[PDB]
Structure formats: C-alpha cells, structure tokens
Symmetry: D2
Subunit: 201 residues, 4 copies
C-alpha cells in the first residue's frame, strides 16, 4: 500500500520500567496499525471518488485522511524519539543543545514548557517540539487529537503522545508521572538528526 507500519527500532520491553511492554505492543500493533490502514483506505476512497466524479463524501474523506495520516506520522516519529535509557544521551548536545538554549533560554525551560503543554491538554493530544520553517525557530505546539492545532509546514522533532491509551494501563490518571518517566527514554540523537534535516526547509 501507500503507507506501511514501521517496525519498532527496539524490543517491545526495551523502554521498561518507564514504559511497559504491554503498552508498547498494543500501542504499536493495534493503534498504529489502525491509522496506517485508515490512511490507505481514505486514499482508495478518494481515488474512487475521482473515477466516478462523486465527491459527496469529500468532507468525511478529508477528515479520515487527516486524522489517520496524522496518527501515522505522529506515532512513526514517537517510536524513533525513544530509546532504552543508557543507549542515548540525556540532554540535547551540540547544535540542538544550542538551538534549544536560543529559543527557550535553557534545557530546563524547554522541558518545563513542553511538560506544561503535555499535561494541560483538554482531550486527546500531543506535546510537540517542532521546527518552524517560516520563523526559523523551534517552538512547542499542543496538538488536539492527531491533526488539530498546528500550522502547515511544521516539522516534528520530538513528540509525546498524550492520548490515554499511551499511559493508562501503567500510570492510570496520573499523566504527570508518565511525562516524568518519559523524559528518561528520549533519544536525543534522533531529535538531533531530525533537527539537522529539518532546518534545511
């Protein structure tokens, strides 16, 4: 198909004890697969709509496409943004580190803003550190669901899934503990690479 489910770059239990393998399996094998399948279906439906010149369901198809594709993009980024603690360094280094100090003042400032954005979401959503092509800067955005509350052209660098399915089985309603534990498995090397390729657009 057009979209395919990427494999995890590590074992399902590699992120423990911070993130359980039980969540990783359901999150990847079930939820992410669903978005991939939904994005492919939306495209097939759009294709049939053009062939028959019937765009009656255009509003539905465009939302299906945006919702599912955004879900695929967000999760694909999410998997690579993590790595077992000890494998990747903590705290941004070199160019990324400097850029963070430039646009946020310091790493602690960025972390606090990102955390506030993650825990304050009213509904399902994401906390996202993106590259703004227009302002040539790094900003934090609070996505609603998967596809709402973000400017076009935004390039994701670091994302934290705040949908309840991402943490409920282990942290229950305490989203704060989930965010705190998550900081331990952030793969700053992946975010650094994304930043390198992002700022050239």
């Amino acid at each position: 198909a057009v979209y395919t489910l990427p494999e995890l770059p590590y074992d399902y239990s590699a992120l423990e004890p911070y993130i359980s393998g039980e969540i990783m399996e359901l999150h990847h094998d079930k939820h992410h697969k669903a978005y991939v399948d939904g994005a492919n279906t939306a495209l097939d439906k759009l294709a049939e709509a053009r062939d028959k010149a019937d765009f009656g369901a255009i509003n539905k198809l465009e939302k299906d496409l945006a919702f599912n594709l955004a879900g695929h993009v967000n999760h694909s980024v999410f998997w690579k943004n993590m790595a077992p603690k000890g494998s990747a360094p903590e705290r941004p280094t070199d160019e990324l580190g400097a850029a963070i100090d430039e646009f946020f003042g310091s790493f602690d400032n960025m972390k606090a803003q990102f955390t506030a954005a993650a825990t304050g979401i009213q509904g399902s959503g994401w906390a996202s550190l993106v590259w703004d092509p227009l302002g040539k800067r790094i900003n934090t955005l609070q996505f609603y669901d998967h596809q709402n509350n973000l400017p076009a052209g935004s390039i994701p660098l670091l994302q934290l899934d705040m949908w309840e399915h991402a943490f409920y089985l282990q942290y229950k309603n305490v989203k704060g503990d989930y965010v705190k534990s998550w900081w331990n498995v952030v793969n700053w090397d992946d975010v650094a690479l994304r930043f390198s390729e992002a700022r050239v657009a």
Copy 2:
C-alpha cells in the same frame, strides 16, 4: 521582528475582475496583519511564561500560536500562489503536471477534488494541495479555520482561502463562483517551485 507581514508581489487590483482590489486590500492590510501581530504576541507571552515559570495559560498560548502562525503561513502562501491573468501558464506543465496526473489521474480530476473540498467546508477553512513527505505524494487537504485537520509535516503547494472574508464582498454566498473565478489567477510557476523544493526534503 520574528514574524513580518510580507508585501503583495502585485498591486491590490492586479487580480481583477476575479478578485476585487477592495478585498485584496482588506484581506492583506487588515486580516493578514492581525495574524502576524497575534503570532508575535503569542511568542512574547510564551517567553514571559518561561521567565516567570508560570505556564498557567499554556493552553491559551499554544492555540494563540497555532491559530495566528497558521493564519500567517496560509496567507503568505496564498498571495504567492496567485498572479495577474496572463503572467503564468493556465495549466501545470513538466514535473508538476506529470505529478498531478500521477496522483490524481488528470488535471481536471485534481481540480474537481480540490473544488469539492473548497466548497464543502462546514465553517471557515482552506482547500489545500500539499506534498506528503511520508507517502511521497501530492494530496488535497481541507483545513478548518487555519490550524485544524492536517498532518504535521504537510508542505503547502497551493492553497485557497475559504473564509467568508476572502469572498463575501464580491461573491456574497455563492462560493462556487469564487472558486471558479480563482482558478484563473493561479500562479503555477510558484506552485511548481514549491513542489521542486518540497521533493528535496
């Protein structure tokens, strides 16, 4: 001076009779100007929040940022996507044209899908032709307001403002006439340029 109001690449009345000069003036000078100020203000507010370590209004600020920055991005592309009748080819050619035929079957099919997405919006929004970096293809998206119903990483190639302020003074409630008339001023050279640079991401 992080965000600035770009000047129109043509005179306010250069798009007539398709889009009146009265609309171009109010649209650029008043509306677009507002989103630039709002985007700048949101960043200043976020910087103040970090300085005082008070992220109590993070939800408001993240939406102020997304809404205004997206408005700024969308209108910035919109102005360049247009040019006086006779300035550029009335139909895509070369790689852009071949890509359109590849992802939509034909130029007419693309126009039909884009038009349906533009006229069907339930509320304020945009019809948008974007480059999908993940699927490596061109898709049409239907934005709600300025910042909703789109995947992160979407590169805008061609956009049509469907907010009522974009056409009400001239076309009133007849959205169909506005869209049909708009096709006459589309600058395919701009779109082709955006496509060339998008594919290299």
Copy 3:
C-alpha cells in the same frame, strides 16, 4: 419536512441602520435555509442507514446533523432576539434584570463579558447567553462554528452571530462596530420570555 425555515418577525429592513436589509435577506433566505435543508437531509440519510443496516458514513452524518441543526437553532433564536429599536425596551427588566445582576454583578458587567466573548473568537462562532440547568445560573458561552464549545442541556437566551457573513457587507473587518450597533436592536422581551421558560428545566 421535520425542520422548517421560520419567517422573520419583522421586515428585512426593520433593523436598519444598525443591520442592513441586504444582510438580513442573504442571512435568512440563503444561509438559514441552507441549514434547514442540511438538517433534513442528515435525518433522511440516517433513516436510510438504519433501513439498509449501513452505518459506514455515521461520522459524517452525525457531524452534518450537529452542524446544520445547530445552525438552524442558533439562527432561529437570533431572529427573535432582535427587534427594531424603540419597539423593545433597552436593558433587561424585572426577573431577567435581577438574574443578570445576580450572575454578572450588573448589566454593564454582563455586556462587557458578552462583548469580549463575541470579538475574541478565533474563527466562526457565536457569543451566547445561556441558562445552565445544572448550576441554575446564566452563563456566557463562546460557540465555535455552530455546534462546538458548549455543554449539553444549555438553553440559549440571547445569541449574537459572529460569523463573517453576519456583518462583513456592512462593517467589513470591524467586528467591534458590529457588536456595538447590535446592542441597539436586542429585544429584551424575547430574552425575558426565554428565561421564564428556560429556568423550569
């Protein structure tokens, strides 16, 4: 059909000079009629879905129903909430007046909160004075489009349409002047009646 387009309780030009007859005609005859037709169509589609046991388009149909029915409800209330200046009294009287002083402090306080809610909307929307059945109080709500940002059970008492089609032809981008002029045509007798029948639920 199930839903019908209500006739205006006054001539199209009765609200002048505050609201032009040109806007009243388009707003009522075109925009409102569209919501009535759309709500009826949504119900017919839902009926067919049940007959054939095909709920594939349920997400589309539920949004179509909510969007259009909310549009019908909001506009129906909107027409009755207005009357030619001099016909209806200015400032709430008796029970309504007391309730407003109780839940807002004073009439000026309510008017200021309502005005701020009306002019600050980021996209299409409504400023609404509703009766809260659960808290047994009058609150101001800011609707997005027609059907978003409101609790179920909310009973509208006074509504102000902030969609651009409601004021653009006369006030252009200056929504502030539109709200200020609108206060002159509010039919406080209609709001009083709605309040009388609302607080018994």
Copy 4:
C-alpha cells in the same frame, strides 16, 4: 459550591462484570472530580475578570468553562443512566419504547445507530441519545471530547462515555466489547424519566 461531585447511586463494584470497580472508582473519584473543580475554577476566574474589567483570557476561560462543565454534565447523566443488572427492564417500554420505535423504527435499529456512533469516534467523545426540542424528536449525537458536535438546547437522555479512560483498563483497545457489555447495565427507568421531563419543555 456552585458545582458539586454527585455520589454514585450504587457501589463502585455494582456494575461488574460489565464495568469493573477499579474503573468506576478512578472514573468517578478522579476524572469526574477534576471536571467539577475545573468548572468551579472557570466561574471564579470569570468573576475575577469582571471585577477587574480584564477579559484578556476570555477565550481560555470560555473553553475551560465549556470543557469542564460539559464533562460534569456528561458524567452526571452517565452514572444515573446505569444500574446493576436486574434492577430495571432490559428493554424500553411504554412511551419511551414507542418513541424509540417512532424515531428509529425499532429498538434494534436505535441500538445499531447508537453503537455505530459510539465506536466510530475519531478521538475522545460520547455517543448520545438526546431530545431535540425544535424537531420534537429523539436523535443520536456524537460528541467530540465533552463539548463539541452538538446543538444548543439538546437534552441528554442516554449517554455512553467513549473516552479511553472509560474502558481501557478492562477492554484495552476493543471498543466493541465495551459497548456491547454496557447495554446490560442501562437503566431505562432513568432514561424514561428524563424523556418525560424533556417533553415538557
């Protein structure tokens, strides 16, 4: 003390094995409690705004009010809509039953439409059976989050929480099993009571 957390009309484990006591406890004690506090806080904030004549955060406060108050309303109806298996009739009777057959053809048709609306939600939301005062009929609505996709004046009769926290601990990703199991604890006497009082509006 404007908004208060209602107590469950039954023990936390009274709905087992359909809905676990663990979920009922967290759902009522933690989640519902949060919306009550948020709704109270929003009103206090709005009162403070009026006192100081500063409505700068009106957009944030109106959403805080709508989101939290709607969460409060939705969960308040939800608890009462349920009762231990064997407490009430497993199928609507009398006027409620006749009304369901009138507006949906049959009870099974209603269940099918309600179920489709519940399982198809793209994000957090609610499946809801409401009384439409304008059309004088019973419709099914699909709420997004707590406060989106619904017309003002909608009277909630029966509601099903589709937020992940409502079923993830027990049913994981299998939404279909949660909905099917939920039908077994629906208190039709409560719904019938709400219908009787709704029709008298």
